[PDB]
Design a protein around this ligand. Sequence first.
Ligand SMILES: OC[C@H]1O[C@@H](O)[C@H](O)[C@H](O)[C@H]1O
Ligand SMILES: OC[C@H]1O[C@@H](O)[C@H](O)[C@H](O)[C@H]1O
Ligand SMILES: [Mn+2]
Ligand SMILES: [Mn+2]
Ligand SMILES: [Mn+2]
Ligand SMILES: [Mn+2]
Lengths: 219, 210, 210, 219
Amino acid sequence: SYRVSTGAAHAAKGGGLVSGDSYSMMELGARKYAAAISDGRAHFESNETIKLLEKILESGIDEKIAIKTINSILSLRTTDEIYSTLDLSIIDLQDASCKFLKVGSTPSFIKRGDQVMKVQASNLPIGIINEFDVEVVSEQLKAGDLLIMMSDGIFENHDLWMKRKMKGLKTNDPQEIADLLMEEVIRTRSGQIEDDMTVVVVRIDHNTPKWASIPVPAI
Amino acid sequence: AMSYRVSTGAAHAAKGGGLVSGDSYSMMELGARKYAAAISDGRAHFESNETIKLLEKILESGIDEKIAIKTINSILSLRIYSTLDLSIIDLQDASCKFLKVGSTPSFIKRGDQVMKVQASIINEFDVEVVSEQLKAGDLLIMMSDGIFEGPKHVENHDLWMKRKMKGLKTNDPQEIADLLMEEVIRTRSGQIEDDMTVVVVRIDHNTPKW
Amino acid sequence: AMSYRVSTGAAHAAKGGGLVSGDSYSMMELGARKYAAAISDGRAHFESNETIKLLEKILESGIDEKIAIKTINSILSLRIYSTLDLSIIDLQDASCKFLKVGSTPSFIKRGDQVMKVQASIINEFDVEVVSEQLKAGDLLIMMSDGIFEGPKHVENHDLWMKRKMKGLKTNDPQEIADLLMEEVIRTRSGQIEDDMTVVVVRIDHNTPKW
Amino acid sequence: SYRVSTGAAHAAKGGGLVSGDSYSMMELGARKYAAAISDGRAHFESNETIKLLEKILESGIDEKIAIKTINSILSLRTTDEIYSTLDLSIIDLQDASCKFLKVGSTPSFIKRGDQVMKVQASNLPIGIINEFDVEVVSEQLKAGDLLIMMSDGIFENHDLWMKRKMKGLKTNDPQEIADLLMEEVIRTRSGQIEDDMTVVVVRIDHNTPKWASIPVPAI
Ligand SMILES: OC[C@H]1O[C@@H](O)[C@H](O)[C@H](O)[C@H]1O
Ligand SMILES: OC[C@H]1O[C@@H](O)[C@H](O)[C@H](O)[C@H]1O
Ligand SMILES: [Mn+2]
Ligand SMILES: [Mn+2]
Ligand SMILES: [Mn+2]
Ligand SMILES: [Mn+2]
């Protein structure tokens, strides 16, 4: 299975504000990659069901209600497949603010400098029924953040292992960090595994290329 | 001013991998606005939009170029969708399908070579459909009108872009994108008459140590 | 001038019916534009649209009226969707859920009785959520501003509509709709200041000979 | 399971042309009925997959291509369920023109006066692969038409039986015609059946209520 490495550059007419151009990309792990440019809407969007989940996150409804509603939405879906687990991270690229939605633990970690914090909510909702083990979190990322997400297989006290090993990373490169973190989990076995393993890593960085600084004429 | 950026990586191992795995992941990026990443334990998380979906299906038919162009037109004449430059890569065998509506155009750089992406009556919406077999190390470059028709006093834009891509002393997609943007902007003088978008994709062999 | 119309019927028998059947059917009508009917042999054919879907899900939660109103508002304040009068009937037990956004309002006629559909802080979009238990022979009547606020010099519109519905000497939905439209139009003089829409639904016992 | 009987009336401001009001309804057989009014889009729409099929019908692409494309669209769907059969009738309410899309025979019949014609294409496409047995038809209906659609169970030379019995109907009322046609199929058994039976009937009629004729002032 081939990988793709991508990159993009975008500039509005009269260097400022909003553009008639749009570009998008999407990757279905190990299967399909798509990229679109349009010169004048979003070329790609979430699932029927993930669209609904996103709308709840986006709303800013209080957290207990969001959890209740997500549970209900999750509640009525095609029994096959049960759509657990779900680990979903949505980064806003204007302010680098990230909303996390988890359905059936994961967990995910944010490495900042040498500090590796786990992605979890400060206030855990109690005194309710949460049948799908739904968790909703809001962190604020900044340039140089490394968000690592993993499945049950690779993740399996495990926080200490991940925390330590993520400090042990001497590289800032996502495709490298992923492969190494895989390597470390596998040699701990010393061979193949019965369970599926996937890890994705995302690095946040602050777009400041030379052409961005080329000045437009004055009057 | 400029929005934040994202650089991503993923590693995947099937159980005794192996044909299949319950696990799946996906990502999508709405340029400059939104990045999403999803992991699920044993129906993709993200998909094309409604109109791109019908066009995507027609591509995936494999029907004759002549009729697909004709049938996509009829579809588009019942919308405007503006222009569309769509590249779809199969990560299993690196084959690629291109759907162009309203031109573009696009280029592939294979070693020192650079070729335009084109297919070997009335075409109302200027539709093209193309297939290619990519290879590890290929660089696919997509761009809007403002980059490609950007250079100030250039007769043959095709030739200008090839020559510039042939001169890229870099296999890094983000550098290439930024370099091509810069070269166009400087032919004017920080002046940006049209919106400018470039997307660069590199095909890699997935073959880590495990 | 006026569009064509449709009058529909369906009969369904499960195998030794019986809890379940591979067969399903559906219909939908986009008022004055489109009618569709589907039969399938062993995922509904038609569904609410994207925004109605989220609102529909919230209704089907069953969450507290106070918070559902509050949560639907927050949802609507991220769109305008205009107004929405939505009635959803469960054909198994004849229970009914109503979602009103931006008023309406609506009425149910049970025998000689006629009651308005209403639920026993800031409500930005004027949202109501209501549940009722309907019964064989009930007549549910829905209408837009132009019908209900239509009558020329009437102080209490609620009372005008009840009195008129109480006087319906007819259990046929299409007749009721046409009669109510006529009564409003004549209070003006063929003059139609606003758009006028009325929808009438009657609940029947399905109990044919078999 | 309850039934609903419905009706509706609609009039644009200043009796003519296009309205800010819209109304819709939908019924999921034996399960759910919904009705919406909006005072200013369609409240209800087809499936993800039926949307795509509809777009192909709507396009006026030639028939062989439409059949090929529908097959491909049909071709890539969730293996469960195989979504065969499909009998789909779409009436345009402006001109009473009906597009039929069939996936795995049915068939459906249009009764006009005492004439009962079967819904099939005049030119059947040959020299192709049609894996889902896709059929696409275009008839023009008129006031007083009775379109009858049925599943494999009730329909089972059967055309002669349906044709005769549909002539034998002495009623113009859809919910009656359906129940009778069920009755006739069942007594032919004389009890219950192993196979599922459903029939839907649609009568086309030409909207001309009294209020439509009430005149608006002249100058
Ligand atoms: O693989 C690289 C790219 O894949 C794309 O589908 C993702 O959207 C992401 O925006 C990029 O990182
Ligand atoms: O049952 C009656 C009604 O059901 C509705 O869902 C259908 O859309 C049809 O427009 C009506 O006939
Ligand atoms: Mn697992
Ligand atoms: Mn442009
Ligand atoms: Mn109005
Ligand atoms: Mn059957």
